[PDB]
Structure formats: structure tokens, C-alpha cells
Amino acid sequence: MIKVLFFAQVRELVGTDATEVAADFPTVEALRQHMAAQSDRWALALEDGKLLAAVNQTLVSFDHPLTDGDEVAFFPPVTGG
Amino acid sequence: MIKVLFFAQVRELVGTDATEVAADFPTVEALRQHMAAQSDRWALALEDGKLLAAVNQTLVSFDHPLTDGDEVAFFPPVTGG
Amino acid sequence: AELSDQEMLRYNRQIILRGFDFDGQEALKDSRVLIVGLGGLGCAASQYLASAGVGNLTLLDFDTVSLSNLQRQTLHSDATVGQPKVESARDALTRINPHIAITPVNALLDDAELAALIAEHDLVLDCTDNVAVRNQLNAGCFAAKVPLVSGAAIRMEGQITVFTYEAGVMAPLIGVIGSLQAMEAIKMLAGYGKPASGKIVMYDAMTCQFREMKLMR
Amino acid sequence: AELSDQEMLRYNRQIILRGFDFDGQEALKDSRVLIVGLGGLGCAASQYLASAGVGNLTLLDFDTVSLSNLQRQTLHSDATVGQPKVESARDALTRINPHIAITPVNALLDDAELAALIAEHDLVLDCTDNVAVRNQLNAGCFAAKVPLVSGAAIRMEGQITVFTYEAGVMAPLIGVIGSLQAMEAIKMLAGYGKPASGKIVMYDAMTCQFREMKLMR
């Protein structure tokens, strides 16, 4: 279906590592809002500006076209060190 | 078929990272000798005692049963540091 | 437990980590870890076990420092060449953190003696270079049921594995693997995160790739 | 190039690595690397760039040492708190290897000045904590066409990427990522192995997993 994976702090906040979801998002940004609307914890975990999307082993814009079978991973960006 | 992968020093010596081969080895040890018989460089790269076999994401004895579709990776063992 | 005002400031960046908090930092202080092999890896791993705050560490090695070792063992120095490794290391380590208690043990213990020693700690670090020792360790640790964070490296290849129960070597490789160990140790000690027991994480420097392979009994 | 009898002994374990040999070790000696940010990562990476043998290193940071930093920046110490980081670091580094030439630069250069500096080295190390700087770097490096080994870490997460063209932080994480950088740098400098350009290697400490994700222009 749509294997939505979660890494690092993102998975930490949402409490799950992966989740299959029904196909229904044109852009990656489409899925970004659905999931974020679940709760305040989800809102923050998937807050815009503080998230990075990776579509099928490759990084993509918050617009890449999503079709059924796609694997989208959501991890945060890192700066510091 | 039989996706035989190579890692670290092993891949270094054999000069290739992966190689598909015709199904024909009962034990992992069966494949171990065929490949090692190719040349002196292959003999050494895959020399018995100095090799580790990994069958489909899991480590296995030099006997695990090999069937078509199997993915066998050959990397050396590490001690030191 | 019980951090001072100064510990609480130095350890801050750790304390504020969600899930760790003051509690974690107190666990660390109360821990008694044993590092076997203060060479390439033993040196890498201890430097961060010390700075992070593990209150009690025991250095176990029978060898002495040498020139060649100075290509990768940062804890040692030209001025300490010849001196035994447990001592060169202790000195450098107590500079990194004057708050922890460091005990050096210049020797080559046998099975009876390792066993007694192991049962005296909460976690052991396999930082050796031969299966003779690695086997004693795995043996003693399993008998007393003390977690083992084992690692190895040579040439351009490393491995790390957890148990809850010549050839050259590029300098930075010992650092990758060594710091991996020190991480996993802290993870176990404070019950933070999920340990890497049940598998071997292999690191291929030549290509910079990491593989995970499931373990079997 | 041209190693002495003493360098040739100290660097041995590197020289005997197949594919590296005397040639590699001479490249390292002839290299001029620039490290920007002698904090958590800058400290981890330089310790192994120094011991391995990169002949010339330039430390660039405007900050000073502090207590909190002593939970992870091993190159610094209580005795150096307050002193600027480029200097605390240079001192510790020259202890690790009295054979290399270290140049500290206590400042905050602007674009004109970074650009001049970059064009003076063979490789740069992004060891900073903000996109302001990281962007200048990426900019200057691309203009002069100088390789960039960039890395970052925070909390329990790291990343490393190569370009050929508060929140807490667990101590050992900076070590994993830092030593990764120092490895890739050496790889580029001597043409040994295959670089990690064209992707981001991400490291998840909480679970100890590594992911590779393809980059796009």
C-alpha cells in the first residue's frame, strides 16, 4: 500500500515506526497535513519546516507525486555538532 | 537467481560486488568451493577458515540449504581493535 | 546518584534529552563498567564513557605504549611510550573527567580471575584483538549474566554486537566503532533506547555502507 | 612528501594497507585541510585527522571553551575553560602529533574571507551548527571547486554527506559522526576507496540503524 516509515525523533513522538495508509495524497505535502491533523503530538512531530521527506530511497520535495505502492519515510533534519 | 554479494576485503580481492550464479549448490559450502576454484586470487579471497557466510539477512553455518532465489553475502570476520 | 551543582552543569546537554533526564545521569554515575583492551578501540570508547559520566571504570590491559600505536590511540602520547597502557590511559582520562573513579589493572588475568572481576561490574567492553580473550569474556559474562558490548576492527572493516544473554588499519575506523560501543554501553546502563543485541552491525569503510545481519542460536 | 624514518614507523599500520602504501601516507602529509567548527564534531574529527597524519590543519572557530562542552569535547579541559577553542584544540592536537603543522584562526570570517581561505586548501570540514555558515561554505567550496565533507548531529541523530561538485546530545554520537567525517576526508585526500558523495548516510542512535538516501539536483 503506502508504507509510511518514521525515523529518529519523529518516530519517537508518534510512537510507531511504520504505518500503512490508504492511497489519497497527490503531493507529499498532502499526506503531511492529514497525519499532522491527528493530534497536537502529531501536529508537532510532523510540523512543517521541521521535517524531511524521503520517497523510495531518494530525497524529494514536499511535492513529489505519490501513487500506491510508494514508501515514504519521515525523519527530521540535523544541524549542530 | 542467486544474488551472491561481496563485502569488505572479500569484494576487494575478487574485484566485483555482486554476481548472479546458476543454482547448483546443496550447502553453502558447495558454493564456497566452486567460486574458490576460479583462481588463486579467488582461492584466497574465499579461503576456508577466513570467511563468513550470511544467508538472506541472517548469519548461517557453512551448510545452510541453498535454493534458487537465495541471496548469499560473503564477508570476512573481524578481530582486533 | 546525587549530582552536585557542577556535575549538573557539565552534564546538562545530556540531562535535557527527553527520556534521559536527571535519572539517566544518576544511573551513569552509579555504574561500574569494565573495559578490556586499552588499545585502538579501548581508547576510543573510554574517552566518551568518561566525558559522558560513567562513574567507575576499570582499565584492563597488560601491554605498553609504543610509537606505531600513536597513529590511532589518541589517549597515549610520545611522552608515555613504554609506560603501560592502563596508566597512560588513566592519566589522560582523568584529565577529561576528574569527577569519575578510574582503576587501572596492569595484567593478564586467567579465567578464574576474569570471572571474579566480571561479577563485580554491570557491563563489560570487549576491546581486545584475539578470540582467546574474547571467548573467556563471552564465557564469564554469560555465567554471571553481565551484558557484553563487543566490537572489532581491522583494515577498513568494523563490527559491533551486543549480548544481553600484520594487517593495517585506518585511524578513524577505530573511532567509528569505538564510539559505537560507548553509545550502546550508555544505552544499556540507563535503559535508554533499544539495544543492538540480536545482530551484528558491520561497517564497510571502503564504501561507507552499513549492514545488519540477524543472529542465530 | 618524503617521510622520515620516524614518520615511517609511526604511520606503519596505515602504510601497509593494500592500496594505500607509502604513496597514501605522502599524500596525507602534503594535504592542507580546513576544519570549520572546533566544537563537538570539529573535536572528534580533528583528533584522527591529526594522528593519521594530515600535514597541515587550520582550525576556524570564534567561540570559547566552557563547562557544558566538557561532556563531549574531549580535546578541551577544565584548565582551558574560557580560553578560545582554536587554541585549546591546537594545544591538545599538537600533543597527539608533533609532526603536523597546525594553524588556529580565532574569528568569524565573512563571505569574502571564507572564499579566500577555502581556495587555499584541498578539502574543507563542515563542523558547524547553523545553516548560515553551512551555506557560505557550500557556496565557497562550489565556487572554488573544493571538496566538502559535511556532517551534523543533535539529540540521538547524525548525518554525513560528501560534495565533490536547547536540544540535548549524547556524548558518543558526536564521535560516531565525527570519526566518519575524518575517514571520508582521508579517502578523498589519497584517492583511497569510493567517497560518499551523492547521498546522505543517516545514523539513528536510539535504535542503532543506518540509512542511505539518494540525493537529487
Ligand SMILES: Nc1ncnc2c1ncn2[C@@H]1O[C@H](COP(=O)(O)OP(=O)(O)OP(=O)(O)O)[C@@H](O)[C@H]1O
Ligand atoms: N588478554 C587480554 N587482556 C587485556 N588486554 C588485551 C588482552 N588481549 C589483547 N589485549 C589488548 O588489546 C589491545 C588492542 O590492540 P589493538 O589491536 O587495538 O592495538 P595493539 O594490539 O596495541 O596494536 P598493534 O597492532 O600496534 O600491535 C592491546 O592494546 C592489547 O594489549
Ligand SMILES: Nc1ncnc2c1ncn2[C@@H]1O[C@H](COP(=O)(O)OP(=O)(O)OP(=O)(O)O)[C@@H](O)[C@H]1O
Ligand atoms: N561561523 C562559524 N565559524 C566558526 N565556527 C562556528 C561558526 N558557527 C558555529 N561555529 C562553531 O561550531 C561549533 C560546534 O558547536 P556544537 O554545536 O558542536 O558545540 P557548541 O556550539 O560549542 O555547544 P553548546 O551546545 O554547549 O552550545 C562551536 O564550537 C561553534 O563555535
